[PDB]
Amino acid sequence: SEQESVKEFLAKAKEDFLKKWETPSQNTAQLDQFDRIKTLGTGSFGRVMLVKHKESGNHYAMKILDKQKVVKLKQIEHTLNEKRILQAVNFPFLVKLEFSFKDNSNLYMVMEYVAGGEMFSHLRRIGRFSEPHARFYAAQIVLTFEYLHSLDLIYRDLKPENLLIDQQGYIQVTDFGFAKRVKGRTWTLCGTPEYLAPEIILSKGYNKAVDWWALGVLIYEMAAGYPPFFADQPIQIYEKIVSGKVRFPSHFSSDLKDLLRNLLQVDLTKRFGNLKNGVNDIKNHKWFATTDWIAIYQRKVEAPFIPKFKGPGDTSNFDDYEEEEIRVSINEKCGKEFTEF
Numbered sequence: 108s109e110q111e112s113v114k115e116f117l118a119k120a121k122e123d124f125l126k127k128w129e130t131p132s133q134n135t136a137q138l139d140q141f142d143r144i145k146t147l148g149t150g151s152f153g154r155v156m157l158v159k160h161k162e163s164g165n166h167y168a169m170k171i172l173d174k175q176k177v178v179k180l181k182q183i184e185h186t187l188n189e190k191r192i193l194q195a196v197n198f199p200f201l202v203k204l205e206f207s208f209k210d211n212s213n214l215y216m217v218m219e220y221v222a223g224g225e226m227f228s229h230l231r232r233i234g235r236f237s238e239p240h241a242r243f244y245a246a247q248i249v250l251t252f253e254y255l256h257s258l259d260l261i262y263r264d265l266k267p268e269n270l271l272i273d274q275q276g277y278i279q280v281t282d283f284g285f286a287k288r289v290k291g292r293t294w295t296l297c298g299t300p301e302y303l304a305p306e307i308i309l310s311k312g313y314n315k316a317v318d319w320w321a322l323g324v325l326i327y328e329m330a331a332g333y334p335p336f337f338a339d340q341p342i343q344i345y346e347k348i349v350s351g352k353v354r355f356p357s358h359f360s361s362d363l364k365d366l367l368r369n370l371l372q373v374d375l376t377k378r379f380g381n382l383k384n385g386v387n388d389i390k391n392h393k394w395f396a397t398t399d400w401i402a403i404y405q406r407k408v409e410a411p412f413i414p415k416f417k418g419p420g421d422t423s424n425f426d427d428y429e430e431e432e433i434r435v436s437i438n439e440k441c442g443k444e445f446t447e448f
């Protein structure tokens with residue numbers, strides 16, 4: 108009956124998610140409440156400077172993003188959706204939006220800061236992961252989805268560059284630009300060619316099931332080094348995906364191979380994850396026997412890699428000198444559009 112504690116947690120999660128979803132938090136800070144140290148990333152619409160909140164002392168990673176440049180890039184909706192999710196969502200493996208606020212010149216998204224970096228570049232460092240070390244990262248992704256999907260959300264953008272390593276060596280998740288709240292099904296072609304599920308390719312209506320295909324791709328690429336479907340031109344990539352014949356490397360476990368063939372199933376009615384048993388197909392799989400799901404959830408597991416910390420305090424601050432500060436315009440720019448933010 109202790110498995111039934113999961114249902115109760117989700118129910119309380121959902122019942123607490125919709126709460127924040129229906130009436131979203133807003134303007135939970137002034138800019139003049141922390142000083143900016145160093146540009147920790149060149150993000151989608153503006154420099155991402157490091158900050159230290161004066162009240163708490165704690166360090167945060169804050170996204171800056173010009174009002175105009177969103178509309179000029181036609182992504183007003185994208186960014187508004189992205190916030191409304193992060194504002195209302197909450198999980199161990201999701202970057203927390205600590206504060207949100209607008210002014211005249213731009214919106215601000217103060218996020219919880221992570222030492223270490225995106226795991227793509229990390230995967231570039233160490234050629235490929237061993238199965239148990241890879242399992243550690245994958246098992247998280249499961250629980251992160253099980254969560255999101257439970258809320259009728261689909262992340263739709265699972266790819267290494269997105270997910271980042273913790274200070275404590277776990278995973279935190281990216282951005283939600285593409286992530287959508289969908290009860291039924293959807294049609295928007297949005298994603299990265301190697302992780303797109305065949306459904307999306309064929310323009311047939313895809314649903315929540317996709318993220319498991321994505322997981323499959325991610326699980327493969329990790330344990331093998333290369334992705335399962337990779338080509339010089341995207342047209343060629345699609346055809347390899349849809350004609351879903353997958354060739355495994357030599358070292359691949361009989362367990363590991365089985366899961367992948369099940370996650371990378373081209374028939375959505377046969378695809379692991381999206382079945383009668385739901386996620387428990389994945390969670391009760393032989394490749395996930397060793398893993399204690401609840402321990403991973405409370406992070407009570409020894410992470411295979413810990414990025415040498417040196418603290419939050421930068422050894423190279425801003426990586427030498429930088430562009431100084433920021434300026435908020437006198438007149439209001441595009442206020443009507445971001446009334447919700």
Ligand SMILES: Nc1ncnc2c1ncn2[C@@H]1O[C@H](COP(=O)(O)OP(=O)(O)O)[C@@H](O)[C@H]1O
Pocket residue numbers: 147148149150151152155168202218219220221222225269281282283284
């Ligand atoms: N909390 C954070 N800590 C450290 N770096 C971050 C954080 N949030 C974002 N970044 C960096 O900013 C870049 C862009 O952010 P991303 O998550 O891709 O969202 P978006 O693409 O919408 O800007 C990423 O490459 C990432 O390295």
Ligand SMILES: [Mg+2]
Pocket residue numbers: 268269281282
């Ligand atoms: Mg991104």
